[PDB]
Short mmCIF file of all heavy atoms in Angstrom, two decimals:
data_model
loop_
_atom_site.label_atom_id
_atom_site.label_comp_id
_atom_site.label_asym_id
_atom_site.label_seq_id
_atom_site.Cartn_x
_atom_site.Cartn_y
_atom_site.Cartn_z
N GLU A 133 25.91 7.34 -4.25
CA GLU A 133 27.07 7.53 -5.14
C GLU A 133 26.63 8.24 -6.46
O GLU A 133 27.32 9.20 -6.88
CB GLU A 133 27.80 6.20 -5.50
CG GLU A 133 28.65 5.57 -4.42
CD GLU A 133 29.20 4.21 -4.76
OE1 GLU A 133 29.37 3.78 -5.83
OE2 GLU A 133 29.58 3.47 -3.75
N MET A 134 25.51 7.79 -7.05
CA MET A 134 25.00 8.40 -8.24
C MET A 134 24.58 9.82 -8.05
O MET A 134 24.71 10.57 -9.01
CB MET A 134 23.87 7.49 -8.83
CG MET A 134 24.32 6.21 -9.47
SD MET A 134 22.99 5.18 -9.93
CE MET A 134 22.25 6.06 -11.36
N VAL A 135 23.92 10.15 -6.97
CA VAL A 135 23.49 11.54 -6.77
C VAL A 135 24.66 12.46 -6.52
O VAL A 135 24.59 13.58 -6.89
CB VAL A 135 22.42 11.70 -5.69
CG1 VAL A 135 21.12 10.95 -6.04
CG2 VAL A 135 22.87 11.28 -4.31
N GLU A 136 25.64 12.03 -5.71
CA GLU A 136 26.87 12.86 -5.45
C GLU A 136 27.57 13.24 -6.70
O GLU A 136 27.90 14.43 -6.87
CB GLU A 136 27.87 12.09 -4.59
CG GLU A 136 27.48 11.97 -3.04
CD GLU A 136 27.11 13.22 -2.34
OE1 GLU A 136 27.83 14.26 -2.40
OE2 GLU A 136 26.22 13.19 -1.59
N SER A 137 27.81 12.27 -7.65
CA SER A 137 28.63 12.57 -8.85
C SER A 137 27.88 12.86 -10.19
O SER A 137 28.51 13.36 -11.18
CB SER A 137 29.56 11.39 -9.06
OG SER A 137 28.88 10.28 -9.54
N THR A 138 26.59 12.59 -10.25
CA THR A 138 25.81 12.79 -11.52
C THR A 138 24.47 13.62 -11.17
O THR A 138 23.87 13.95 -12.21
CB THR A 138 25.40 11.58 -12.23
OG1 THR A 138 24.25 10.86 -11.58
CG2 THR A 138 26.50 10.65 -12.36
N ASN A 139 24.15 13.80 -9.91
CA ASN A 139 22.87 14.40 -9.59
C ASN A 139 21.54 13.69 -10.02
O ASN A 139 20.46 14.22 -9.86
CB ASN A 139 22.78 15.92 -10.12
CG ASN A 139 23.50 16.78 -9.19
OD1 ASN A 139 23.62 18.02 -9.53
ND2 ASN A 139 23.91 16.46 -7.99
N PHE A 140 21.74 12.44 -10.48
CA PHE A 140 20.56 11.59 -10.84
C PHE A 140 20.72 10.23 -10.21
O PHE A 140 21.73 9.64 -10.31
CB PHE A 140 20.47 11.45 -12.30
CG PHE A 140 19.19 10.67 -12.76
CD1 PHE A 140 18.03 11.31 -12.97
CD2 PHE A 140 19.31 9.32 -12.99
CE1 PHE A 140 16.86 10.48 -13.34
CE2 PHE A 140 18.24 8.58 -13.39
CZ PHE A 140 16.99 9.19 -13.60
N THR A 141 19.65 9.69 -9.65
CA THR A 141 19.43 8.22 -9.48
C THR A 141 17.97 7.88 -9.67
O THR A 141 17.08 8.69 -9.67
CB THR A 141 20.03 7.70 -8.10
OG1 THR A 141 19.98 6.34 -8.24
CG2 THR A 141 19.19 8.27 -7.00
N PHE A 142 17.69 6.64 -9.86
CA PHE A 142 16.44 5.95 -9.95
C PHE A 142 16.22 5.08 -8.89
O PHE A 142 16.99 4.23 -8.56
CB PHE A 142 16.40 5.17 -11.29
CG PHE A 142 15.00 4.57 -11.58
CD1 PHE A 142 13.95 5.39 -11.89
CD2 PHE A 142 14.96 3.23 -11.58
CE1 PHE A 142 12.69 4.87 -12.19
CE2 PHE A 142 13.70 2.60 -11.88
CZ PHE A 142 12.58 3.45 -12.15
N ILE A 143 15.04 5.17 -8.22
CA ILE A 143 14.57 4.37 -7.15
C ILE A 143 13.44 3.47 -7.62
O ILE A 143 12.36 3.96 -7.84
CB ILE A 143 14.14 5.25 -5.89
CG1 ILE A 143 15.19 6.30 -5.48
CG2 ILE A 143 13.62 4.38 -4.77
CD1 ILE A 143 16.60 5.62 -5.42
N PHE A 144 13.80 2.21 -7.76
CA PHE A 144 12.80 1.21 -8.36
C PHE A 144 11.90 0.73 -7.28
O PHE A 144 12.33 0.04 -6.40
CB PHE A 144 13.58 0.08 -9.06
CG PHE A 144 12.74 -0.89 -9.86
CD1 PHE A 144 11.66 -0.43 -10.60
CD2 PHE A 144 12.93 -2.22 -9.78
CE1 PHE A 144 10.83 -1.34 -11.34
CE2 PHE A 144 12.14 -3.09 -10.50
CZ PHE A 144 11.11 -2.66 -11.24
N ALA A 145 10.64 1.00 -7.48
CA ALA A 145 9.68 0.88 -6.31
C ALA A 145 9.48 -0.51 -5.80
O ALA A 145 9.55 -0.76 -4.56
CB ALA A 145 8.35 1.46 -6.73
N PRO A 146 9.40 -1.53 -6.62
CA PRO A 146 9.28 -2.93 -6.08
C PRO A 146 10.53 -3.27 -5.25
O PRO A 146 10.27 -4.02 -4.20
CB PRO A 146 9.22 -3.74 -7.36
CG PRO A 146 8.66 -2.83 -8.47
CD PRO A 146 9.28 -1.53 -8.14
N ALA A 147 11.63 -2.82 -5.51
CA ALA A 147 12.86 -3.02 -4.75
C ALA A 147 12.90 -2.34 -3.37
O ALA A 147 13.31 -2.80 -2.38
CB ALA A 147 14.13 -2.74 -5.52
N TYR A 148 12.34 -1.05 -3.41
CA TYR A 148 12.37 -0.19 -2.20
C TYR A 148 11.09 -0.25 -1.28
O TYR A 148 11.22 0.17 -0.15
CB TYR A 148 12.62 1.18 -2.57
CG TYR A 148 14.09 1.43 -2.92
CD1 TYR A 148 14.66 1.07 -4.04
CD2 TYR A 148 14.87 2.10 -1.96
CE1 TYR A 148 16.11 1.25 -4.27
CE2 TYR A 148 16.28 2.29 -2.17
CZ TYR A 148 16.84 1.87 -3.31
OH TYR A 148 18.15 2.15 -3.52
N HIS A 149 10.08 -0.89 -1.74
CA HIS A 149 8.94 -1.12 -0.98
C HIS A 149 8.43 -2.61 -0.89
O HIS A 149 7.61 -3.07 -1.44
CB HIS A 149 7.71 -0.47 -1.67
CG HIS A 149 7.87 1.04 -1.87
ND1 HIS A 149 7.77 1.88 -0.74
CD2 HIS A 149 8.16 1.82 -2.94
CE1 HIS A 149 8.00 3.10 -1.13
NE2 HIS A 149 8.28 3.14 -2.45
N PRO A 150 9.21 -3.33 0.00
CA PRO A 150 8.87 -4.74 0.21
C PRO A 150 7.49 -5.02 0.75
O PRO A 150 7.00 -6.17 0.57
CB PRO A 150 9.94 -5.20 1.22
CG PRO A 150 11.12 -4.17 1.13
CD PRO A 150 10.41 -2.90 0.88
N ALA A 151 6.90 -4.07 1.48
CA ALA A 151 5.52 -4.28 1.98
C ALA A 151 4.45 -4.42 0.89
O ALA A 151 3.39 -4.92 1.22
CB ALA A 151 5.21 -3.11 2.97
N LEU A 152 4.79 -3.92 -0.29
CA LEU A 152 3.85 -4.07 -1.48
C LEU A 152 3.75 -5.53 -2.03
O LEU A 152 2.80 -5.75 -2.83
CB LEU A 152 4.17 -3.19 -2.60
CG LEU A 152 4.11 -1.65 -2.31
CD1 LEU A 152 4.44 -0.91 -3.66
CD2 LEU A 152 2.80 -1.24 -1.66
N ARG A 153 4.73 -6.39 -1.74
CA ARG A 153 4.75 -7.76 -2.36
C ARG A 153 3.49 -8.51 -2.28
O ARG A 153 3.10 -9.11 -3.30
CB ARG A 153 5.99 -8.53 -1.69
CG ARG A 153 7.44 -8.07 -2.05
CD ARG A 153 7.75 -7.93 -3.58
NE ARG A 153 7.70 -9.17 -4.19
CZ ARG A 153 8.13 -9.38 -5.53
NH1 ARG A 153 8.54 -8.32 -6.21
NH2 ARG A 153 7.97 -10.57 -6.04
N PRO A 154 2.68 -8.50 -1.06
CA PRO A 154 1.37 -9.09 -0.96
C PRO A 154 0.26 -8.30 -1.71
O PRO A 154 -0.71 -8.76 -2.05
CB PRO A 154 1.05 -9.17 0.54
CG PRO A 154 2.43 -9.11 1.19
CD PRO A 154 3.21 -8.25 0.31
N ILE A 155 0.47 -6.94 -1.74
CA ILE A 155 -0.53 -6.01 -2.42
C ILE A 155 -0.56 -6.28 -3.91
O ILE A 155 -1.62 -6.09 -4.52
CB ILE A 155 -0.33 -4.50 -1.96
CG1 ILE A 155 -0.85 -4.45 -0.52
CG2 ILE A 155 -0.97 -3.52 -2.84
CD1 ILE A 155 0.12 -4.51 0.68
N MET A 156 0.55 -6.51 -4.56
CA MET A 156 0.65 -6.59 -6.00
C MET A 156 -0.25 -7.62 -6.72
O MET A 156 -0.87 -7.28 -7.70
CB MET A 156 2.09 -6.70 -6.51
CG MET A 156 2.94 -5.40 -6.33
SD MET A 156 2.35 -3.84 -7.05
CE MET A 156 3.48 -2.76 -6.27
N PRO A 157 -0.31 -8.96 -6.22
CA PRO A 157 -1.24 -9.83 -6.81
C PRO A 157 -2.73 -9.41 -6.72
O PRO A 157 -3.47 -9.59 -7.74
CB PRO A 157 -1.15 -11.05 -5.86
CG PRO A 157 0.29 -10.87 -5.24
CD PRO A 157 0.53 -9.44 -5.14
N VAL A 158 -3.05 -8.77 -5.70
CA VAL A 158 -4.36 -8.29 -5.46
C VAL A 158 -4.78 -7.16 -6.47
O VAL A 158 -5.81 -7.13 -6.98
CB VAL A 158 -4.61 -7.77 -4.00
CG1 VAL A 158 -6.08 -7.21 -3.84
CG2 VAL A 158 -4.36 -8.90 -3.02
N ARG A 159 -3.75 -6.29 -6.77
CA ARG A 159 -3.96 -5.23 -7.75
C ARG A 159 -4.15 -5.77 -9.13
O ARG A 159 -4.81 -5.21 -9.95
CB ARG A 159 -2.74 -4.24 -7.71
CG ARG A 159 -2.81 -3.41 -6.49
CD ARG A 159 -1.48 -2.54 -6.49
NE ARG A 159 -1.45 -1.65 -7.56
CZ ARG A 159 -0.48 -0.81 -7.86
NH1 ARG A 159 0.71 -0.97 -7.22
NH2 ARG A 159 -0.49 0.12 -8.83
N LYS A 160 -3.43 -6.89 -9.49
CA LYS A 160 -3.59 -7.54 -10.78
C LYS A 160 -4.88 -8.19 -10.92
O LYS A 160 -5.62 -7.99 -11.90
CB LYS A 160 -2.41 -8.58 -11.11
CG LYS A 160 -1.01 -8.05 -11.07
CD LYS A 160 -0.73 -6.74 -11.73
CE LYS A 160 -0.53 -5.54 -10.69
NZ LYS A 160 -0.97 -4.14 -11.19
N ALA A 161 -5.23 -9.04 -9.99
CA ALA A 161 -6.54 -9.73 -9.97
C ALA A 161 -7.80 -8.80 -10.08
O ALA A 161 -8.75 -9.14 -10.84
CB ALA A 161 -6.74 -10.54 -8.70
N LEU A 162 -7.68 -7.58 -9.46
CA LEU A 162 -8.83 -6.63 -9.50
C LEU A 162 -8.90 -5.94 -10.80
O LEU A 162 -10.01 -5.63 -11.26
CB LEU A 162 -8.65 -5.55 -8.35
CG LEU A 162 -9.12 -5.89 -7.00
CD1 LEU A 162 -9.09 -7.38 -6.55
CD2 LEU A 162 -8.33 -5.10 -5.93
N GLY A 163 -7.80 -5.53 -11.39
CA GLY A 163 -7.70 -4.92 -12.72
C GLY A 163 -8.57 -3.55 -12.76
O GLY A 163 -9.38 -3.43 -13.63
N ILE A 164 -8.37 -2.83 -11.73
CA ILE A 164 -8.89 -1.44 -11.69
C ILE A 164 -7.86 -0.50 -11.16
O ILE A 164 -6.81 -0.90 -10.61
CB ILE A 164 -10.20 -1.34 -10.79
CG1 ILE A 164 -10.02 -1.94 -9.41
CG2 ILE A 164 -11.39 -1.97 -11.44
CD1 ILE A 164 -10.89 -1.49 -8.36
N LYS A 165 -8.08 0.74 -11.39
CA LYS A 165 -7.28 1.76 -10.69
C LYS A 165 -7.51 1.67 -9.25
O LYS A 165 -8.70 1.54 -8.82
CB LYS A 165 -7.65 3.19 -11.25
CG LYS A 165 -7.28 3.43 -12.65
CD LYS A 165 -7.55 4.85 -13.15
CE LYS A 165 -7.03 5.06 -14.56
NZ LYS A 165 -7.84 4.66 -15.68
N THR A 166 -6.51 1.74 -8.45
CA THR A 166 -6.61 1.82 -7.04
C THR A 166 -5.90 2.99 -6.49
O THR A 166 -5.31 3.77 -7.25
CB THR A 166 -5.99 0.60 -6.27
OG1 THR A 166 -4.58 0.66 -6.34
CG2 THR A 166 -6.37 -0.72 -6.95
N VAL A 167 -5.88 3.15 -5.16
CA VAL A 167 -5.17 4.25 -4.49
C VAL A 167 -3.69 4.13 -4.65
O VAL A 167 -2.96 5.18 -4.56
CB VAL A 167 -5.56 4.34 -2.99
CG1 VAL A 167 -4.96 3.08 -2.23
CG2 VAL A 167 -5.18 5.64 -2.33
N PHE A 168 -3.17 2.98 -4.93
CA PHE A 168 -1.69 2.77 -5.15
C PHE A 168 -1.23 3.43 -6.46
O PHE A 168 0.03 3.79 -6.46
CB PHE A 168 -1.33 1.32 -5.10
CG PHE A 168 -1.28 0.82 -3.63
CD1 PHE A 168 -2.28 0.15 -3.13
CD2 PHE A 168 -0.15 1.12 -2.87
CE1 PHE A 168 -2.31 -0.27 -1.83
CE2 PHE A 168 -0.04 0.69 -1.58
CZ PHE A 168 -1.17 0.03 -1.01
#
């Protein structure tokens, strides 16, 4: 709806990538740059 009438939308990654839910704790614990 937003792209049709305004040409802009925002895709919020935590909402659209449910497979990352287990990956996120591991990224916080490590506290380094990763491939993600």
Side-chain angles (χ1 to χ4, degrees):
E133 286 175 22
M134 284 173 76
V135 297
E136 289 302 316
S137 74
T138 78
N139 277 174
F140 182 87
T141 190
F142 181 69
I143 305 314
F144 187 41
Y148 279 79
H149 299 286
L152 297 187
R153 294 303 297 187
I155 284 95
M156 290 305 172
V158 177
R159 292 173 66 189
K160 302 317 104 211
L162 278 28
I164 49 160
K165 292 185 172 85
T166 74
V167 73
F168 282 97

